């Protein structure tokens, strides 16, 4: 239900685990959303700038790609950021404390 799914949607996000309950992450919130929606589960591809020890991640959900504009220090932190981009750009709840 989102006709044009080309390209990449981006926002400027970094995952800050202090905003989340113990051991709940955007990846889990997004995965549960896909399951609730009977959607294929998210697919993450890592991007690297190894000379800077930087990481980015592109997540595909319902054929649309999402990615943060910002780089991070680890594959896992970048994957969390990509999940946030996917949720926040759609207006969905992100799983934070008191949301």
From Swiss-Prot:
Effect of residue 75 to A: Decreased affinity for tRNA. Strongly decreased affinity for tRNA
Name of the protein described by the UniProt record: tRNA-dihydrouridine(20) synthase [NAD(P)+]-like
Subunit relationships: Interacts with EPRS1. Interacts (via DRBM domain) with PRKRA and EIF2AK2/PKR (via DRBM 1 domain).
Region of interest (Interaction with tRNA), residue spans: 23-27, 76-80
Recorded family membership: Belongs to the Dus family. Dus2 subfamily.
Gene: DUS2
Effect listed in the UniProt record for changing residue 53 to A: Mildly decreased affinity for tRNA
Source taxon at top rank: Eukaryota
